[PDB]
Motif scaffolding. Structure first.
Motif, PDB file in Angstrom:
ATOM      1  N   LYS A 197       6.316  -7.281   1.576  1.00  0.00           N
ATOM      2  CA  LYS A 197       5.912  -8.692   1.460  1.00  0.00           C
ATOM      3  C   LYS A 197       4.928  -9.071   2.565  1.00  0.00           C
ATOM      4  O   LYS A 197       4.953  -8.505   3.659  1.00  0.00           O
ATOM      5  N   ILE A 198       4.064 -10.036   2.286  1.00  0.00           N
ATOM      6  CA  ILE A 198       3.163 -10.554   3.310  1.00  0.00           C
ATOM      7  C   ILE A 198       4.002 -11.017   4.475  1.00  0.00           C
ATOM      8  O   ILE A 198       5.023 -11.662   4.281  1.00  0.00           O
ATOM      9  N   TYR A 199       3.558 -10.680   5.680  1.00  0.00           N
ATOM     10  CA  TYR A 199       4.208 -11.105   6.913  1.00  0.00           C
ATOM     11  C   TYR A 199       3.144 -11.355   7.995  1.00  0.00           C
ATOM     12  O   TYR A 199       1.930 -11.155   7.728  1.00  0.00           O
ATOM     13  N   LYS A 200       3.574 -11.763   9.204  1.00  0.00           N
ATOM     14  CA  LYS A 200       2.603 -12.046  10.273  1.00  0.00           C
ATOM     15  C   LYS A 200       2.573 -11.064  11.450  1.00  0.00           C
ATOM     16  O   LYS A 200       3.589 -10.643  11.955  1.00  0.00           O
ATOM     17  N   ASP A 201       1.360 -10.800  11.906  1.00  0.00           N
ATOM     18  CA  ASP A 201       0.989  -9.955  13.026  1.00  0.00           C
ATOM     19  C   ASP A 201       1.593 -10.532  14.252  1.00  0.00           C
ATOM     20  O   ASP A 201       1.891 -11.724  14.302  1.00  0.00           O
ATOM     21  N   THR A 202       1.729  -9.695  15.266  1.00  0.00           N
ATOM     22  CA  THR A 202       2.100 -10.158  16.593  1.00  0.00           C
ATOM     23  C   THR A 202       1.096 -11.188  17.075  1.00  0.00           C
ATOM     24  O   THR A 202       1.360 -11.917  18.027  1.00  0.00           O
ATOM     25  N   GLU A 203      -0.077 -11.191  16.449  1.00  0.00           N
ATOM     26  CA  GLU A 203      -1.117 -12.183  16.696  1.00  0.00           C
ATOM     27  C   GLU A 203      -1.234 -13.376  15.733  1.00  0.00           C
ATOM     28  O   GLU A 203      -2.209 -14.110  15.824  1.00  0.00           O
ATOM     29  N   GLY A 204      -0.338 -13.510  14.760  1.00  0.00           N
ATOM     30  CA  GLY A 204      -0.430 -14.615  13.807  1.00  0.00           C
ATOM     31  C   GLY A 204      -1.054 -14.334  12.436  1.00  0.00           C
ATOM     32  O   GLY A 204      -0.925 -15.142  11.520  1.00  0.00           O
ATOM     33  N   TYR A 205      -1.689 -13.173  12.281  1.00  0.00           N
ATOM     34  CA  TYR A 205      -2.482 -12.871  11.089  1.00  0.00           C
ATOM     35  C   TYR A 205      -1.687 -12.294   9.914  1.00  0.00           C
ATOM     36  O   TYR A 205      -0.902 -11.356  10.070  1.00  0.00           O
ATOM     37  N   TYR A 206      -1.920 -12.857   8.725  1.00  0.00           N
ATOM     38  CA  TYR A 206      -1.266 -12.399   7.523  1.00  0.00           C
ATOM     39  C   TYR A 206      -1.572 -10.959   7.259  1.00  0.00           C
ATOM     40  O   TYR A 206      -2.731 -10.542   7.306  1.00  0.00           O
ATOM     41  N   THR A 207      -0.514 -10.200   6.989  1.00  0.00           N
ATOM     42  CA  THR A 207      -0.575  -8.750   7.024  1.00  0.00           C
ATOM     43  C   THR A 207       0.420  -8.276   5.985  1.00  0.00           C
ATOM     44  O   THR A 207       1.347  -9.020   5.623  1.00  0.00           O
ATOM     45  N   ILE A 208       0.234  -7.051   5.509  1.00  0.00           N
ATOM     46  CA  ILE A 208       1.168  -6.432   4.584  1.00  0.00           C
ATOM     47  C   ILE A 208       1.126  -4.915   4.703  1.00  0.00           C
ATOM     48  O   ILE A 208       0.202  -4.356   5.331  1.00  0.00           O
ATOM     49  N   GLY A 209       2.132  -4.250   4.131  1.00  0.00           N
ATOM     50  CA  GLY A 209       2.147  -2.778   4.063  1.00  0.00           C
ATOM     51  C   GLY A 209       2.402  -2.205   5.441  1.00  0.00           C
ATOM     52  O   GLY A 209       3.311  -2.672   6.116  1.00  0.00           O
ATOM     53  N   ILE A 210       1.611  -1.240   5.903  1.00  0.00           N
ATOM     54  CA  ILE A 210       1.851  -0.800   7.255  1.00  0.00           C
ATOM     55  C   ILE A 210       0.826  -1.440   8.174  1.00  0.00           C
ATOM     56  O   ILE A 210       1.092  -2.483   8.802  1.00  0.00           O
TER      57      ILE A 210
ATOM     58  N   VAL B 276       3.746  -9.636  -3.007  1.00  0.00           N
ATOM     59  CA  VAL B 276       4.615  -8.458  -2.898  1.00  0.00           C
ATOM     60  C   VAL B 276       3.974  -7.254  -3.555  1.00  0.00           C
ATOM     61  O   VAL B 276       3.344  -7.385  -4.585  1.00  0.00           O
ATOM     62  N   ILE B 277       4.140  -6.075  -2.976  1.00  0.00           N
ATOM     63  CA  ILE B 277       3.488  -4.892  -3.546  1.00  0.00           C
ATOM     64  C   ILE B 277       4.428  -3.710  -3.689  1.00  0.00           C
ATOM     65  O   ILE B 277       5.506  -3.686  -3.110  1.00  0.00           O
ATOM     66  N   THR B 278       4.027  -2.741  -4.494  1.00  0.00           N
ATOM     67  CA  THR B 278       4.737  -1.476  -4.602  1.00  0.00           C
ATOM     68  C   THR B 278       4.497  -0.622  -3.360  1.00  0.00           C
ATOM     69  O   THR B 278       3.538  -0.856  -2.599  1.00  0.00           O
ATOM     70  N   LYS B 279       5.363   0.353  -3.128  1.00  0.00           N
ATOM     71  CA  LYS B 279       5.066   1.363  -2.113  1.00  0.00           C
ATOM     72  C   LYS B 279       3.704   2.057  -2.368  1.00  0.00           C
ATOM     73  O   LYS B 279       2.946   2.305  -1.437  1.00  0.00           O
ATOM     74  N   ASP B 280       3.377   2.341  -3.621  1.00  0.00           N
ATOM     75  CA  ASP B 280       2.134   3.029  -3.939  1.00  0.00           C
ATOM     76  C   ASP B 280       0.879   2.262  -3.572  1.00  0.00           C
ATOM     77  O   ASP B 280      -0.134   2.852  -3.137  1.00  0.00           O
TER      78      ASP B 280
END
Length: 318
Positions: free
Chosen positions: A167-180, A208-212
């Motif tokens: 799922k989309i989440y936030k960076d240690t810096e505030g930025y929207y991020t996903i996956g690894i 939300v995304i698949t592992k692939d």
């Protein structure tokens, strides 16, 4: 004389332009210098001549990569050709033109291509325009498998060391991020993030995304990192000297600390480049790095030290 060349199928992303196709048609590959293809019967043909020709390619020098031990792992696309060679003159049908390793692996396994491959010399033409000649297709298939393994393993390695979120989440810096790794947008808007993600994935995600998919994104990220590593006068010599597993550990460090962070371990890198692994390991264990993320540093270091996957092996495919 190339044997079967008009047999079987050719996998190419590039599509040039009931017809004239019987005639020879010559074309330069859009992105690269000294790739001149000749199409008869709709089939791509690579030709090399020691002499000069208007429609033929200058002779290609052979790459230093070991056909038995080596890897294509961090190359983006590769080309695969079968054909024949006799002094001054080389003629190779193109079986795969600038495809991925996985693609090439499956394409060379088609029984219809089977004929043309067992009867001719097989070679790979790299994006730097050097070639690796192979003894036989079985060997080449080995070479490709060994490469794709490194590709699937590096994802698992980073899943375990960095973490993988679907799922989309936030960076240690505030930025929207996903996956690894992956940064979607530096904008404060969640819709901007979601919209960026839909564009990158090409479907309606709702965040939300698949592992692939995460794996796809991650591969883009490994390429951006390798492109930056080779641009950096401090990293490049080390990266150039390392085998594929060890490069994975180097990339891991870059993913975690930045090109600039990794360039700061000056002595540990010189030690790595001189193949003194235990010293490099000891030295690397001195840093605040080792103290702050100790599990990850320990595995990365074990990886630098052994050239194997031993710290990650039991954890894979989880």
């Amino acid at each position: 004389v190339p044997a079967f060349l008009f047999s079987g199928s050719t996998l190419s992303s590039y599509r040039p332009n009931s017809i004239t196709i019987a005639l020879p048609h010559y074309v330069d590959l859009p992105g690269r210098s000294n790739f001149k293809l000749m199409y008869i019967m709709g089939f791509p043909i690579d030709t090399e001549m020691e002499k000069d020709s208007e429609y033929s390619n200058k002779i290609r020098q052979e790459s230093k990569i070991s056909k038995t031990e080596g890897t294509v792992s961090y190359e983006q696309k590769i080309t695969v050709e079968t054909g024949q060679e006799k002094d001054g003159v080389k003629v190779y049908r193109v079986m795969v033109l600038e495809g991925t390793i996985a693609e090439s692996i499956e394409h060379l396994d088609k029984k219809e291509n089977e004929d043309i491959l067992n009867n001719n010399r097989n070679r790979i033409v790299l994006a730097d325009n050097t070639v690796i000649n192979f003894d036989n297709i079985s060997q080449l298939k080995e070479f490709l498998r060994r490469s794709v393994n490194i590709v699937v393993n590096i994802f698992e390695m980073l899943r375990i060391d960095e973490g993988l979120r679907l799922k989309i989440y936030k960076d240690t810096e505030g930025y929207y991020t996903i996956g690894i790794g992956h940064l979607l947008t530096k904008s404060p808007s969640l819709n901007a993030a979601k919209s960026e993600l839909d564009k990158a994935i090409g479907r309606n995600t709702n965040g939300v995304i698949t592992k692939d998919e995460a794996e796809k994104l991650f591969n883009q990220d490994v390429d951006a990192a390798v492109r930056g590593i080779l641009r950096n006068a401090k990293l490049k010599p080390v990266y150039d000297s390392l085998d594929a597993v060890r490069r994975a550990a180097l990339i891991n460090m870059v993913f975690q600390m930045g090109e600039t962070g990794v360039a700061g371990f000056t002595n540990s890198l010189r030690m790595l480049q001189q193949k003194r692994w235990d010293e490099a390991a000891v030295n690397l264990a001195k840093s605040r790095w080792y103290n702050q993320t100790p599990n990850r540093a320990k595995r990365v270091i074990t990886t630098f030290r052994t050239g194997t996957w031993d710290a990650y092996k039991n954890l894979f495919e989880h």
